[PDB]
Amino acid sequence: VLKTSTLIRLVQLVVSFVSLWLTAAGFLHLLENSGDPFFDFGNAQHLTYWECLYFLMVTMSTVGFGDIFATTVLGRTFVVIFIMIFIGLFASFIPEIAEILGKRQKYGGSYKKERGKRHVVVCGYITFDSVSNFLKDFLHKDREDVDVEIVFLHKGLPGLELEGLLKRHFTQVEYFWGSVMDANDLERVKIQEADACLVLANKYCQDPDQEDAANIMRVISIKNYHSDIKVIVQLLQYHNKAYLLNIPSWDWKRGDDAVCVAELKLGFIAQSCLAPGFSTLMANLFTMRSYKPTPEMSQWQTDYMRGTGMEMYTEYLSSAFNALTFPEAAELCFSKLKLLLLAIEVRESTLAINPGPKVKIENATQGFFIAESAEEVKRAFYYCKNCHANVSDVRQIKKCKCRKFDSTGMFHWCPDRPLNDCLQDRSQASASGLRNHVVVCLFADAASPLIGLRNLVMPLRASNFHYHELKPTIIVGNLDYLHREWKTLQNFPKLSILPGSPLNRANLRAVNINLCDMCVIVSAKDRNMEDPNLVDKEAILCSLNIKAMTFDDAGANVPLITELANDSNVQFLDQDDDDDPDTELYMTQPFACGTAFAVSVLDSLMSTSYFNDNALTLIRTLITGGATPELEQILAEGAGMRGGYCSPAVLANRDRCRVAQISLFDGPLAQFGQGGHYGELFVYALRHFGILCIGLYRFRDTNPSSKRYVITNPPEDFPLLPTDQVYVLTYK
Amino acid sequence: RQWYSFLASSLVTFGSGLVVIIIYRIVLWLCGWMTEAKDWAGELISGQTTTGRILVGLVFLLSIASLIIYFIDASTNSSSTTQQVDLAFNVFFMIYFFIRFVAANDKLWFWVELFSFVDYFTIPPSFVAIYLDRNWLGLRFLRALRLMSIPDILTYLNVLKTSTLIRLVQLVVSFVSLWLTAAGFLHLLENSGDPFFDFGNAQHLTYWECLYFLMVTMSTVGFGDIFATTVLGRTFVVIFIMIFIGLFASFIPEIAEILGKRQKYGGSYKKERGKRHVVVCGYITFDSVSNFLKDFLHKDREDVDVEIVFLHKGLPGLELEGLLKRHFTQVEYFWGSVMDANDLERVKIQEADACLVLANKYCQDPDQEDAA
Ligand SMILES: [Ca+2]
Ligand SMILES: [Ca+2]
Ligand SMILES: [K+]
Ligand SMILES: [K+]
Ligand SMILES: [K+]
Ligand SMILES: [K+]
Ligand SMILES: [K+]
Ligand SMILES: [Mg+2]
Ligand SMILES: [Mg+2]
DSSP states (O other): OOOSHHHHHHHHHHHHHHHHHHHHHHHHHHHHHHOOGGGTTOOOOOOOHHHHHHHHHHHHTTOOOOSSOOOSHHHHHHHHHHHHHHHHHHHHHHHHHHHHHHOSOSSOSOOOOOSSOEEEEEEESOOHHHHHHHHHHHSOSSSOOOOEEEEEEESSOOOHHHHHHHHHSTTTEEEEESOSSSSHHHHHHTTTTSSEEEEEOOSSSSOHHHHHHHHHHHHHHHHHHOSSSEEEEEESSSTTHHHHHTSSSOOTTTTOOEEEHHHHHHHHHHHHHHSTTHHHHHHHHHSOOOOOOOTTOOHHHHHHHHHHTOEEEEEEOOGGGTTOBHHHHHHHHHHTSOOEEEEEEEOOOEEEESOOSSSBOOTTOEEEEEESOHHHHHHHHTOOTTTGGGOOOGGGTTOOOOOOEETTSOBBOOOOOOHHHHBOOHHHHHHSOOOSEEEEEEEOOSSSOOOOTHHHHHHHTBTTSOTTTSOOEEEEEOHHHHHHHHHHHTSSTTEEEEESOTTOHHHHHHHTGGGEEEEEEEEOSOSSSSOSSSTTHHHHHHHHHHHHOOOOOOOTTSOEEEEESOSGGGGGTOSSSOOOTTSOGGGSHHHHTTSEEESGGGSTHHHHHHHOHHHHHHHHHHHHTOOOHHHHHHHHTTSOSOEESOOHHHHGGGOOOOEEEEESSSSTTHHHHHTOBHHHHHHHHHHHHOOEEEEEEEESOOOOOOOEEEEESOOSSOBOOTTOEEEEEOOO | OHHHHHHHHHHHHHHHHHHHHHHHTTHHHHOOOTTHHHHHHHHHHTTOSHHHHHHHHHHHHHHHHHHHHHHHHHHHOOOOHHHHHHHHHHHHHHHHHHHHHHHOSOSTTTTTSHHHHHHHHHHHHHHHHHHHTOOOOTTOGGGGGGGGGHHHHHHHHTOOOSHHHHHHHHHHHHHHHHHHHHHHHHHHHHHHOOGGGTTOOOOOOOHHHHHHHHHHHHTTOOOOSSOOOSHHHHHHHHHHHHHHHHHHHHHHHHHHHHHHOSOSSOSOOOOOSSOEEEEEEESOOHHHHHHHHHHHSOSSSOOOOEEEEEEESSOOOHHHHHHHHHSTTTEEEEESOSSSSHHHHHHTTTTSSEEEEEOOSSSSOHHHHHHO
16 A cells, blocks of 8 residues: 555654554553552552543653653653653654655646636746746736736746745746656646747856756657647757757747857857947847836936837738838838837748838738837837828827848858968968957867857858958967867858967957957856856956057057856946946946847847747847758758859848948938937938938947947937947848 | 534535535536636735735735734623624625635635635624624634735735745744644633533633743643643643644744844944055955954054954954954954945945955965955
C-alpha cells in the first residue's frame, strides 16, 4: 500500500510514537493505581488511563504542569526514565513530521481554460526580475487591451517577492509547478489549446551554451507534444540557432521566432557604426513606456523622455488611404493624425519599408506606426476624408462614425581565405591609411565562448552600400580566439585583424582610432563568475583609455559604443553627470547619447514578437540588412556563406531602405535648421527625396562637449538648430 | 438546546450549501456573467482598481474592529451598542462572501475554505442572536482568523517590499491569529464544560487568562498556575502542545534573524566646519587598520585635527570595534561600498581632503585585488 520513502517514514514515525505513548501511559496506570510493595501497597493515587496520557504528553513535551504528578516510588522512577527517553523521541518526532508534511508542493493543480479567453505559457528562466520586466511590457496601458492570460510553468517554487507579484496580477497571471519536459505538465497547463509559448532565458549565467541547450530541449519537448503551436525562444549564442531550424516541427511560416540576443545586440551596435545613436533609438521603441515628465529634469532630458514613450505599432489603414501613394499617405499620418508611418505590408505578404510613389495602398493594408500608444494609432483606422478634414484637434478623431555577392543578393561576398591574408602588425596597420572606419576593441581569452562578430560585421557589409562606401573594420584581440570566428568572418571584404589587447595605446595609434567613425568595445569573457563590480573592468578601462588619449596631426571626440554585462556599471563610462543606481539604464546619460548599450533593453522584445509578429521581422530587415530566412537555412546546411556573381534579377534587391544621418549644416535642408520647425522639414524631405525623418541627434550642451542625444519622433512644432543631425530612411 | 440552535444555524448554511452545487455538478455532468463578473470581482478583491482598494482597505479595518467587539464582550461575560453595531460588520462580510464566490474558479472547493468556514460560524449566529434574543460567544473567536488575510491585503496594495518584511508580517500575523483563536477555543471548552458529564465541570476562565495559559504551554514553561480541568479542554491542550511548540520553535529564531539583519554602522558622517577628514577604503581589517592608525595618529607628527572615515562593505569584527571606540573623536566607521554614489554623499567625500585605497597584500592572486 505504502510507496515512496516519505509515506513509509511518516507511518513508521506516527505509529511507533503512538504505540510507545499508549504503552507508557498504561505502565503508569498500573504502577500508580497498584501502588508499590515498598510500602505494603498503601500509597496509590487513582488515575484513569486517560489522565496518564495527558500527564505523559505534557512531561514528554517538557511543559510539566504539575496538574497531575507521580506520588508512588515505582511511578516516579518510570517518569525519570520516561523523561530521559521520550524527550528524545518528541524532539525528533515533530520536526521530522514538519519536514514530511511541508514537502507538499503548493502551486500544483491545473489551468482551467475559459471559452473566449486565449492564454500563453511562459517557461524557462522565471525569477522576480525576469517576470517583473516581462509583465510590465506584456500587461501595459499602451497596448490594445485584449483579454490574454499568462501561465508561468516552472520547476522551482517561487520566492516571496514573486508570490506578491503573482497575487497583484490575480486575474491574468497564474503560476504552476512542474517542467516543460514532462508531457503530463503540458496537459496540465493546456498548451494544446493555448495560443503561444514563450521560452525565457537567463542572460547572466556561468556559460551560455548549457542555458541554450536547455531552451532548445524545452522547444523539442513542446513540439514533441504538439507540432502546430507558436514557440518563441530567447537564445544567447547565434550558432545554437541552427539547431532549432533543423527541428522538423519548427515552422518559420507560423511565427516561431528565435529571438537570438547576440544577433540583435551586435546588430543594434552595427547600425550605430553607420549612424551613431541608432542603437538607443530602436531600443526605446520596443520597451513599452509612458511619458511622465518630473520637474527635476532639464531641457535635454524632457525631450529625450518623450522619445522613450514612442513605440512600434501595427494597425490597418482606413478606406480613405485606398488608391493613394505612400509619400502622400505618410504625410497625412504625420500632418493631420500625428503618427509617423514607416512601412506598409503588401498582399507571401512582403514588408516594404518606406517605398517610393510607385507602391500604392491597396484595401485593408497593415501599416507600421511609431506613436505614443496603440489607441493613438487607432486614429488611422477611424480616419475619414469627408468628416475629419477640417478638425484641428486630433483627439476629436475618436469618432468611428464616418563584383562578388551572396546567393540571396544581400551582402558583399568573398572567396574563402586563411587568417594570414587579413592579419596585420603595428607596422602594416599604420602603413594602411585608415580613415572613416570601424574599430572592434575585442576582449577575449583563448578558451572564452564565441560572441559571433559575424553578426556585427555582416550588416556593415550590406548590399545597399557600394564597395568604395564600405567602412573597413579592424578587430583587435587574441589570435587564439579569432581563429575560431575566422570560419564565419572570412567571407567579408575590408576586414583586418590585429593581435594584442586594445588597452595598449600602441595598438590603437596604429589603427588611427582618432579617425574612427565608431569604435565598438565588446567583451567575450565570462560574465558573472566572481563579482558585479569587476565584470566590465576591461570595457570601462578601454573606453576611459580612449577618452584620455591625445593626438597630434580629438581625445574625447572619438565616438565609441560599449557593450555591458551590468546595467549599474553604465555610470562609470561618462565623467560628467548625476548618477544613481536607482535610475534605470534607459534614462542615463551614456545610453541616451548612444555611448552605451546593455543587453537588458531587449527583454521587451519577447513580448513584441508575440503581439506584433511582423514588428520583429521588420527590424531584422532594417538592422542586419536583409537577413532573409533563405540565408538561415543555407547557414544551417553548414557550408558557410556562398554565392558568386548572380543574375540581374537577384542584384535588383540592392534597393532597400537603410538608415542614415543628415546634418542640417550644408545642403538644401540647412534652411530649416536656422529658424523653422521639425514638421516643416519632414514634409519637404518626404516629397522631393523620398525620406522619412524618424528623429533627431541634438547636442546636449548649447550655450562644450560633443555628446549628442536621441529624440525619436518629436512633435510637429519642435524647433531645430543648425547643429542637429536627423535620422532618415533612404533610397540611395 | 441553546448550544444546538446557534451551532445548527452554521451547519445548515454549510450542509445545504454543498447540496446546492452538487446538483449543478450532476446536472452538467449528464450534459456573459460567468466570465465578466468573475473578472470584475477578481479585480475588486485583488486591490488593483481604486474602487477595489476601498473593499481591501475596509476588510483590513473591519476585521480588526469586529475582533475588538469580541474582546469587549468576552471580557465581562435585547439591544445594545455592542450587539446591534456588530451586524454592520457581519452584513458587510456576507456581501464580501458573495463577491469571493463570483471571483473564485472552483465553486464547490470555495465552500470548504478557511474564510468560508469562518463566515458560517460567525455571521448566521449573530442574526440568530437578535432573532432568539440571546448573546452567545460560541464561535466568535474565529474572527481572529480574519487577521490572516493582512499579508495578502498589504501585498495587494504593494505596501510590503523585499522578502524580509513580507516574511516578517506573515510570521507575526499568522502567529498572533492562531494564538488568539486557540485562546478562544479553550475559552469555549473550559467555560461551557462538556456533554460527557452533563456540563457539570466548568472552571470559569476569562479569555485573557487563556492567552496567558497558552503562551506559557506554547513556550514549554508550564507554570500550572492555570490548568485545564475539562476533558475536551485537556484534549485540545494535548493537540496544542504537539502543534504550537512547533510554531514557537521556528517563530522566535526566524524573527531574531530578521530583526538582527539591520546593519549597525549606517548613518552619515556629519562634517564640522574647521576639521578636514579622510576617507579610508578597500581592505579594512583589524591588522590593516591598527598598522594604519599607529602611523597616521602618532605623537611624533604635527598634531593637526584630521578625522578618519572608514568606508567599508563588511561589518567590523569585535577587535576592530574596540579599536574604533578607543579612537572615538577622530575615527569613524561606516557601512557601504565606494562603488555606490549614495555612500559617497553619505561619507561626504566631495568636501573631504583625500581618499586612501588600502590593499590586501596577502591574497590568492594580486590581479583581482588591484582590479578592484
Ligand atoms: Ca507610450
Ligand atoms: Ca558618470
Ligand atoms: K521546557
Ligand atoms: K517546562
Ligand atoms: K514546567
Ligand atoms: K509546573
Ligand atoms: K502547584
Ligand atoms: Mg482566471
Ligand atoms: Mg566627530
